[PDB]
Write a protein that binds this ligand. Structure first.
Ligand SMILES: CC(=O)N[C@H]1[C@@H](OP(=O)(O)OP(=O)(O)OC[C@H]2O[C@@H](n3ccc(=O)[nH]c3=O)[C@H](O)[C@@H]2O)O[C@H](CO)[C@@H](O)[C@@H]1O
Ligand SMILES: CC(=O)N[C@H]1[C@@H](OP(=O)(O)OP(=O)(O)OC[C@H]2O[C@@H](n3ccc(=O)[nH]c3=O)[C@H](O)[C@@H]2O)O[C@H](CO)[C@@H](O)[C@@H]1O
Lengths: 420, 420
């Protein structure tokens, strides 16, 4: 049980390299189950979830490994097992993405149903439903979702009840090998879905409209293989931009894709920051200024990302003025607020809305990481708080932030990873 | 990391002894900080939270121990330390109750602010506010709530913004030694508050209206000591009644206080059960019948208790018909639903409402305990599911259920506690 010791009162400035997106690499890795020929992935961050995914794949018969260059080589030519075991799946709800490819290509698959989650309900009803529409027969027995289709899946129009990144990806994946044309209406538009779509296309798939609420897929016999560089992580990028915005510093994020963070960049500018976007980098200069409070309302892409909500709660807590933060995606994603309040922040919670009252300076103390995005927010808070800050259950960060210690340290942060 | 192995397909019938209420023993234990003379508590369940509380007390200078009879002897005559340390408080948010007594009697106290919680936000703003109204000066520094009053607290009328069991108890405790008369309006009416009130009265306090939304307290110089038998646990009682109702069995709960479960008992009867209440026992005979789905709406006492919500979600999932369960107290208290769905249950979640569709039989599998009331619900589900069920993170039950293994086993359950 590791925990970070962070020394406060610091200005975070400098350069930081942005890695590939966890939420792109994950679905792409499961989508590789459809590949009949070799696959090579680059810009894949080293994260716990990637490792767990690899284990699930190997367990299905997929041969995969990361080489000395960091690239991930994957061969799914001889998959002979069709069950994503509970032992592994219980540690990563994203593995639900194993079901779609397996049924589509092998006409059978098994993945254990999701468990309870601290930030909110995470059912997969839309995933199951979408697959059934495509012709899959699904039975729920022994905690497993068991799909089976006596023949190749059948394209059709599916109108997803609500905007779901997960279900959009599952259905898109299965559609690739279905007979006929599939239309995914009211689809999520997230950049990770576009990237997964492009990945699939490189292997023969025929997907159009990815990134819009209207995705069209013309099923094909089978997918081949390819080499693909994972899309830069917009959330990691947004996080480091926040590092500068909350500390008066100036940070330059390298290897970015600015057009995936319009909502974030505009809120940062609204907060009083200057950000310049080039095709491969994004710079944020807070100008040694305290930020101005701004209202936040999370929403499906291209709106403000829920995955940046905790980071902006921190920005508003040190900003000048009152702010209204409305979380519309999940129902319990404010667990970071009490921890931040322990550090001197001020927020009043009511329903899915937090009304924050910015203060000039936070104070270091002990806090507990409750989730992925909250964990980084607490570390960042520790960087600008007076004195020392200790963050427990820091294992959460390793789920979405590659070498976060070195990267932050590279921006002037003084942080030591110790074991309690 | 222990976990329960439960063998399903069983009818739970028999007798079970009900212990004292965790939510009465806890506040009473912290209230004992006001005692200048010896205190003797009986019917105090052996729970992790009680142990942690004892540690906090000893750390303040209180001499306390449980003897061979099970009674808890406590001497708070020489308290010489006034800080409930974060090291301990971080493991039990209820320790916030240490602040009120300490400030009231010693005119100073320190307790660390609460952290994030999985079932919902658990701020203590109403606690702090109530104490300030009484004249306490409070500062938040280094993650601690530091109270101080240059003189004896001062009675006044306090209108709590919302119904809070915790804040009602904190203010009531401090009011006992304030100068003048204090009125707590819009107070929570829970049975545990009444019991704590009676406890305080036995030591000289002057509290009236406990159990109603209007509590009147006439401050006094100091409190003495006494012997007190903790009120029976209505939630534990409700839980075992559910054991019979979901399995077609017949259970008799001994050493009860039926008038604290009217809402629960009436819903059980609505579900098709026969329950007979005597002054010291409550019997539920399901009559070998499958229950009828009933709607649930949690609310402050005397309405349906949120602490029985998970238990009734299980009842409705095996019942006949559709049910609407509305949780109005906390915002993420449905983490048990996905786990139960893994077992065959069916529920659709939307906001603070779960629409369940009862099924005839659940199926055994692996599930994870997410919280206290959810953990027991999963164990109970395992008792009536076909085959075998394994419940992980079972350490949650030990927070509110004394010797739960023996008690359930005493009702016909086959359960083995093993270490993964
Ligand atoms: C591995 C990954 O990519 N995770 C991201 C993904 O998660 P995730 O896959 O859960 O995102 P979704 O957009 O699909 O769903 C979000 C909401 O839809 C609900 N829902 C989803 C599926 C379903 O079948 N039924 C249903 O009711 C969820 O309960 C939740 O309220 O999108 C979230 C919103 O951008 C991000 O914060 C996550 O980091
Ligand atoms: C140790 C103990 O006795 N725990 C019980 C107690 O908890 P607890 O003390 O939290 O109960 P409260 O009734 O005081 O409060 C419940 C609600 O009030 C809110 N709130 C509370 C205090 C405050 O200062 N500000 C505020 O906003 C909470 O966020 C929550 O939404 O009552 C709950 C409701 O019966 C039970 O489920 C808990 O098992």
């Amino acid at each position: 049980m590791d925990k970070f010791r962070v020394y406060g009162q610091s200005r975070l400035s400098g350069s930081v390299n942005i890695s590939g997106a966890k939420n792109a690499a994950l679905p792409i890795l499961f989508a590789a189950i459809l590949a009949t020929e070799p696959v090579k992935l680059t810009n894949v961050p080293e994260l716990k979830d990637i490792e767990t995914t690899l284990k699930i794949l190997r367990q299905l018969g997929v041969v995969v490994d990361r080489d000395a260059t960091g690239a991930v080589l994957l061969d799914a030519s001889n998959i002979n097992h069709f069950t994503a075991p509970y032992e592994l799946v219980k540690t990563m709800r994203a593995s639900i993405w194993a079901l779609a490819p397996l049924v589509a290509r092998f006409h059978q698959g098994q993945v254990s149903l999701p468990g309870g989650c601290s930030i909110g309900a995470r059912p997969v009803d839309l995933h199951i439903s979408g697959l059934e529409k495509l012709g899959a027969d699904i039975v729920l027995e022994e905690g497993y979702v068991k799909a089976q289709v006596s023949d190749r899946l059948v394209g059709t129009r599916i109108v997803i009840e609500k905007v779901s990144v997960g279900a959009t990806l599952s259905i898109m994946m299965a559609a690739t090998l279905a007979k006929g044309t599939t239309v995914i209406e009211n689809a999520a538009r997230e950049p990770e879905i576009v990237d997964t779509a492009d990945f699939l296309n490189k292997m023969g798939a025929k997907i159009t409209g990815a990134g819009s609420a209207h995705i069209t897929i013309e099923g094909v016999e089978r997918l081949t293989g390819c080499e693909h560089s994972v899309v830069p992580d917009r959330i990691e990028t947004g996080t480091f931009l926040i590092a500068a915005a909350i500390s008066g510093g100036c940070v330059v994020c390298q290897n970015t894709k600015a057009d995936t963070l319009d909502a974030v960049i505009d809120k940062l500018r609204e907060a009083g920051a200057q950000v310049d976007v080039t095709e491969n980098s994004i710079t944020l200069d807070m100008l040694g200024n305290r930020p101005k409070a701004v209202n936040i309302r999370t929403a499906p892409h291209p709106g403000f990302p829920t995955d940046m909500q905790a980071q902006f709660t921190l920005l508003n807590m040190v900003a000048e003025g009152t702010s209204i933060i409305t979380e519309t995606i999940f129902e319990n994603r404010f667990m970071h607020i009490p921890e931040l309040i322990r550090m001197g922040g001020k927020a009043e919670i009511e329903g899915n809305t937090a009304v924050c009252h910015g203060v000039e300076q936070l104070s270091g103390t002990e806090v507990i990481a409750t989730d992925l995005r909250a964990s980084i927010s607490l570390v960042l808070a520790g960087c600008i708080a007076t004195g020392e800050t200790i963050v427990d259950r820091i294992y959460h960060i390793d789920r979405g932030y590659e070498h976060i210690e070195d990267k932050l340290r590279g921006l002037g942060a003084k942080i030591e990873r110790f074991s309690g």
